Design a protein around this ligand. Structure first.
Ligand SMILES: CNc1nc(Cl)nc2c1ncn2Cc1cccc(C(N)=O)c1
Length: 164
C-alpha cells in the first residue's frame, strides 16, 4: 500500500538532485550514498536537522525521467574509501567529498511526461522537472511527485520509520 509512504513523507522536505551521468545514480542505489557540490551540501546538512525526513529526488540529465527517491539518514561525512564517482568535466573529486548516507524509498523511474501537472512554487511555478541540482521542492508538490512513482515492492519502509 501507500500508508507507510505517506507517513514517511509527512512534513518532509524535498530536494531535486541532478546528476550528469547514470553511473553515479547506479552507484548511489547500490551503496546507499550521495555526494553533491559544497553549496548544496551545506543546504542538505541544515535541512537534515530541521525536518523529520529529507527526501532527495534524482534525475539524470538528458534522461527525461526521475530515477527514484531516497531519504537522508545522515549529515555529510568525510573519511572513507573515496567513492569511485564518474566525474564530469571538472568535478575534482574534492568537490564530491562529503558523503551522505541515504535509504532508498523508490528505485523505479518516472518519466517527466507523468509529472507535467505538478509545478514548484519555490522555482517560479515551473514544472517540477525544471530546476538546478539542489533546488528545493515545496511540500505539497514534492509529496504529489513522490506519490506518482510506481510502487517499489522490494523496499520495506518499516526500518525507515524507525530511523525517524
Ligand atoms: C555524485 N554527485 C554528482 N555526480 C554527477 Cl555525474 N553530477 C552531479 C553530481 N552532483 C551534482 N551534479 C550535477 C553537476 C555536475 C558538474 C557541475 C555542476 C554545477 N552546479 O556547476 C552540477
Amino acid at each position: 500500500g501507500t500508508s507507510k509512504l505517506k507517513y514517511v513523507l509527512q512534513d518532509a522536505r524535498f530536494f531535486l538532485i541532478k546528476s550528469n551521468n547514470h553511473e553515479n545514480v547506479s552507484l548511489a542505489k547500490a551503496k546507499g550514498v550521495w555526494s553533491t557540490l559544497p553549496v548544496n551540501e551545506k543546504k542538505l546538512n541544515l535541512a537534515f536537522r530541521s525536518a523529520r525526513s529529507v527526501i532527495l529526488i534524482f534525475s539524470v540529465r538528458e534522461s527525461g525521467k526521475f530515477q527514484g527517491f531516497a531519504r537522508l539518514s545522515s549529515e555529510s561525512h568525510h573519511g572513507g574509501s573515496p567513492i569511485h564517482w564518474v566525474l564530469p568535466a571538472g568535478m575534482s573529486a574534492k568537490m564530491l567529498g562529503g558523503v551522505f548516507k541515504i535509504d532508498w524509498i523508490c528505485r523505479r523511474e518516472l518519466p517527466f511526461t507523468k509529472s507535467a501537472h505538478l509545478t514548484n512554487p519555490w522555482n517560479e511555478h515551473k514544472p517540477v522537472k525544471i530546476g538546478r541540482d539542489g533546488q528545493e521542492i515545496e511540500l505539497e508538490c514534492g509529496t504529489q511527485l513522490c506519490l506518482l512513482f510506481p510502487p517499489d515492492e522490494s523496499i520495506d519502509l518499516y526500518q525507515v520509520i524507525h530511523k525517524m
